[PDB]
Design a protein around this ligand. Structure first.
Ligand SMILES: Nc1ncnc2c1ncn2[C@@H]1O[C@H](COP(=O)(O)OP(=O)(O)NP(=O)(O)O)[C@@H](O)[C@H]1O
Length: 328
């Protein structure tokens, strides 16, 4: 029989009305810049797929960020490049300034605009109620834009949000896990970082959509307003679902899997237990009360739903009373 199919409730067929070239990233021909324009200054770190450097563009004297891609999962390289080009200029989307071949690695190196970020661990401790609202609204601008352009980010988390708090400026970065949304398409569930993974990923439901990003944003919101980092603190991908079930309850979880004719991994049988849905007030205390309001709680509740179809869209989120106090 198999799982019941799903489609996005918004921007469903945006890519089908595009030229093939827009989404067929495999056919994309990279336009290469000159590597000698960029002088590496220091290494900022490296992940699974790349090494990241602060650099200078010696032609304009500007600071840039250079991500030198490792020679692996090369399908991702043209996918990221194409998405960055498609989204360039969009609200709060990081700007790809250049693509060059690194002489040492012989691999593509992506050159981005510099953004003056502060450690989210340090920064979130300082955010006022107003600032959480403000920056949430800025993230939503980015998400509604990429979703409208037929793209899901799939790795929304604090590390992928660069905030210049001095200039009240925000950019959504690291589009290397991003994909084009095509209705009916089955996607890899091995995306997002543990604490930000949606229930759809955790129960191995492949026919997911933009709404994945909205769960991830809800996890961010919960962590900020409740000052609990992370909000859902799983030991592994299985315990992650259990942590979610302890807040949202097991009956709505079983209703979700029943709706999509999904079968839980049988290892959950002995660890999931039975849990009531909690009221969001359970998580409020003297130290976080100033960040919590009825509006915040209602908005959070509408993001953190098991059913990906039930979650607020980015545009719906922007309509929420929580943002009425934020100056437009
Ligand atoms: N557009 C940008 N402007 C300024 N700094 C950036 C930009 N993009 C990334 N960085 C910085 O570069 C550093 C490393 O980049 P990133 O690609 O996230 O590697 P990473 O953090 O090692 N990945 P992981 O170890 O898997 O979490 C981060 O700490 C960022 O602060």
């Amino acid at each position: 029989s198999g799982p019941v199919p799903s489609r996005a409730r918004v921007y469903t067929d945006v890519n089908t009305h595009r030229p093939r070239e827009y989404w067929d990233y495999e056919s994309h021909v990279v336009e290469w810049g000159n590597q000698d324009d960029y002088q590496l200054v220091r290494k900022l770190g490296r992940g699974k797929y790349s090494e990241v450097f602060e650099a200078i563009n010696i032609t304009n004297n500007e600071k840039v960020v250079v991500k030198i891609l490792k020679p692996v999962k090369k399908k991702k390289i043209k996918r990221e490049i194409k998405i960055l080009e498609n989204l360039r200029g969009g609200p709060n989307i990081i700007t790809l300034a250049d693509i060059v071949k690194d002489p040492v690695s012989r691999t593509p190196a992506l050159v981005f605009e510099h953004v003056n970020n502060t450690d989210f661990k340090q920064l979130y401790q300082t955010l006022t109620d107003y600032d959480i609202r403000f920056y949430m609204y800025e993230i939503l601008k980015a998400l509604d834009y990429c979703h409208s352009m037929g793209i899901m980010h799939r790795d929304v988390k604090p590390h992928n949000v660069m905030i210049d708090h001095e200039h009240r400026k925000l950019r959504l970065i690291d589009w290397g896990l991003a994909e084009f949304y095509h209705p009916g398409q089955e996607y890899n569930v091995r995306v997002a970082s543990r604490y930000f993974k949606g229930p759809e990923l955790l129960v191995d439901y492949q026919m997911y959509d933009y709404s994945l990003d909205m769960w991830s944003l809800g996890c961010m919101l919960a962590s900020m307003i409740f000052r609990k980092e992370p909000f859902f603190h799983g030991h592994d991908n299985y315990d992650q679902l259990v942590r979610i079930a302890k807040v949202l309850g097991t009956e709505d979880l079983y209703d979700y899997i029943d709706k999509y004719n999904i079968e839980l991994d049988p290892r959950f049988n002995d660890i999931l237990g039975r849990h009531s849905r909690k009221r969001w007030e359970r998580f409020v205390h003297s130290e976080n009360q100033h960040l919590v309001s009825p509006e915040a709680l209602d908005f959070l509740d509408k993001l953190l739903r098991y059913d990906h179809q039930s979650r607020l869209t980015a545009r719906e989120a922007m309509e929420h009373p929580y943002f009425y106090t934020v100056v437009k």
